[PDB]
Design a protein around this ligand. Sequence first.
Ligand SMILES: NC(=O)C1=CN([C@@H]2O[C@H](COP(=O)(O)OP(=O)(O)OC[C@H]3O[C@@H](n4cnc5c(N)ncnc54)[C@H](OP(=O)(O)O)[C@@H]3O)[C@@H](O)[C@H]2O)C=CC1
Ligand SMILES: NC(=O)C1=CN([C@@H]2O[C@H](COP(=O)(O)OP(=O)(O)OC[C@H]3O[C@@H](n4cnc5c(N)ncnc54)[C@H](OP(=O)(O)O)[C@@H]3O)[C@@H](O)[C@H]2O)C=CC1
Lengths: 518, 135, 68
Amino acid sequence: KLSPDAIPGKWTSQDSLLGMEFSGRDASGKRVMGLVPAKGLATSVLLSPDFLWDVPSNWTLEEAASVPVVYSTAYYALVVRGRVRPGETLLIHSGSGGVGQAAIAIALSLGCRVFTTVGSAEKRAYLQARFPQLDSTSFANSRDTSFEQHVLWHTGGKGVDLVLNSLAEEKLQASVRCLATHGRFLEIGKFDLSQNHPLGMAIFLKNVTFHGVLLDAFFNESSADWREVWALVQAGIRDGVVRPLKCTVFHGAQVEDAFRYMAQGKHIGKVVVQVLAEEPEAVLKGAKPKLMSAISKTFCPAHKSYIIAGGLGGFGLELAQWLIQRGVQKLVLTSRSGIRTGYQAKQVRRWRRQGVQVQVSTSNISSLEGARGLIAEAAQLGPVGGVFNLAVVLRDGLLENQTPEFFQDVCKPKYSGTLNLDRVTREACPELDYFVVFSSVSCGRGNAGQSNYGFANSAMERICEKRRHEGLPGLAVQWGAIGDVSGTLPQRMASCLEVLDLFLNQPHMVLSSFVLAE
Amino acid sequence: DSTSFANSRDTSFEQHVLWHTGGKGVDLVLNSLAEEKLQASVRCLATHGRFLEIGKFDLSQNHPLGMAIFLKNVTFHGVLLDAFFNESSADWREVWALVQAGIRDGVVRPLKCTVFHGAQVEDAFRYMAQGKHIG
Amino acid sequence: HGLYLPTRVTAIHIDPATHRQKLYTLQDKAQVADVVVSRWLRVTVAGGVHISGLHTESAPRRQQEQQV
Ligand SMILES: NC(=O)C1=CN([C@@H]2O[C@H](COP(=O)(O)OP(=O)(O)OC[C@H]3O[C@@H](n4cnc5c(N)ncnc54)[C@H](OP(=O)(O)O)[C@@H]3O)[C@@H](O)[C@H]2O)C=CC1
Ligand SMILES: NC(=O)C1=CN([C@@H]2O[C@H](COP(=O)(O)OP(=O)(O)OC[C@H]3O[C@@H](n4cnc5c(N)ncnc54)[C@H](OP(=O)(O)O)[C@@H]3O)[C@@H](O)[C@H]2O)C=CC1
């Protein structure tokens, strides 16, 4: 129901944005609970110390996971934005949920009277048990617009000062009418705001402050304004206002069950996933978390350098875009001509702006001296990680019109180039981890009029097979037809890149991928 | 400076503010203009912006306000000074102290005045009605 | 990245007379109009058209995956 790009900040993953809060052991071993913009569900997280709190000894790490998000947003909405003061009357929707409970705990501490809305009766009972201060006159129904009448009646027709709204459509408009003069409306939902629904401006004749609250801005920006909310949360933690919520714990292996439990909508409290079990020691100073079986996918170090022979060419530019997304921050692209089109300049400028240390080269991998020069440039940038050979020089034609010169021309980039790259990499590349060369189904199946191209592709496979039997990395991917950049339909670049992601992990030497027509 | 001025009767202050601010907008808008001008002014706000509304016409007419502006953190205020007289004296003392401090610090300077004698109060009303006065 | 479709436009102005005035023929027989996009001002102007306040929202991929 939510598009990944809606989350503020540029992630490019299209996934892994799940999770916002966690509780675990700092690198040293202290018990901490943090607040990450995204990527909270994981066996580890990389977060700045400004977003980490210290778990008091009275708490267990299971409890810690419920405090950060709800209490940070509650404090930000009330104390920082609404400037709630003691004795005021405020309305909090969905009191059973975490945000509502944090708002109630903050409000009752100041001495404010509270009106709340709860969908079912058991939620009313639970809230009555949690906060004995509330009476039978402090409740209403969140599933209809009847709470307007309740709040207007019990407040003497005046209304309420603050209203923390999480509802939508007609229920938002109803909550607007409950405001009293000099009221403040704190909006934390995102449906009506996203849809640009209208709000009658006649409510502002009454001195009113309509607040748009989004805690996401703090995670990626506005660091200075964050320390205020951090201090408020810490003071609440020490002063007993911040009490951990109820926690329904699911194991790590049953995460889909946890998501289904959340989806059903029956939970009261905070759903927590137990990635790992807490130990009695107050400071474990452990080395690593326990290992688990997880799908394997490709990533690259930041200090490694990668090379794409024939990179400027269109299959090469999509492969590079894929690589930059997987962490490659220094690159080397080879091409005889150099940047000679608007598209290539656009892409390279964008990558340089992103921080990638791109460098276009003209060294020809055909000549062994050229291969040494290319590897030397990559070494100058950094230790060599991989070598992708995508160079190709087609000279098609039936065997009758083929000649030695055309065969030599086709073979120089692919066969000779791969040989020279292999030799130089063996000599002077210890840290190398990938070595890929691209072939065509014209090699396996065979095609008419491409005998030279087929021969050139086949020889590359042999070098890769030899490399793998010797223990060094190697791989040859035989493609069909690439779409965006035989009797087989063109394959889209998205599918091709996904498949290449799959192939780099398997143990086989030569692989293939093509789509059958009809 | 000369880049701090724009045009009010026309709606050309949107391009000016956006251009000279780098497209970010502004942190605070004190608005006393009409419907189209008001809608143009809201679009000038930056993130975390604040829209102080001292007019009456749009509020009285109950004209609509697109809530998408609130997706960006924003604070929309309806500023009616008259509430201080009917109640909220404790709140009023804050404004009183602010104005007194401004007077005793030099921040508050007296505006220009066009004096009309008592017997010509009708002339004063007409002159203000013409709308050509400064001060 | 991904595909974004229009969902709201604040204001659009069209004027065929100015449009006819703006179009300039290329060296070949084709007729061309020069466009500008100012993201700071949120205006897309070309010939006799003026799009202001365009807002686009990401659309989920159909995931037809017709290619397997
Ligand atoms: N502005 C911002 O940036 C932030 C926004 N929020 C908002 O705060 C609200 C509460 O968030 P959170 O702390 O997770 O609280 P919960 O998700 O626990 O609260 C959900 C509440 O919504 C109602 N509800 C009804 N059906 C469902 C269902 N199927 N699934 C979930 N809820 C259901 C219930 O209240 P009832 O029965 O009374 O209707 C329930 O208690 C959300 O609207 C969230 O978007 C939170 C923090 C930051
Ligand atoms: N995309 C496809 O349809 C399929 C292609 N393949 C193989 O997969 C890869 C995909 O690339 P592809 O889309 O064909 O790219 P192109 O054929 O569009 O371009 C090939 C690239 O190699 C460069 N190149 C050619 N000769 C040399 C040389 N001697 N030294 C350095 N660079 C050189 C070219 O630049 P310049 O000309 O300036 O040197 C260009 O950048 C290739 O290896 C191709 O053979 C196989 C199956 C499917």
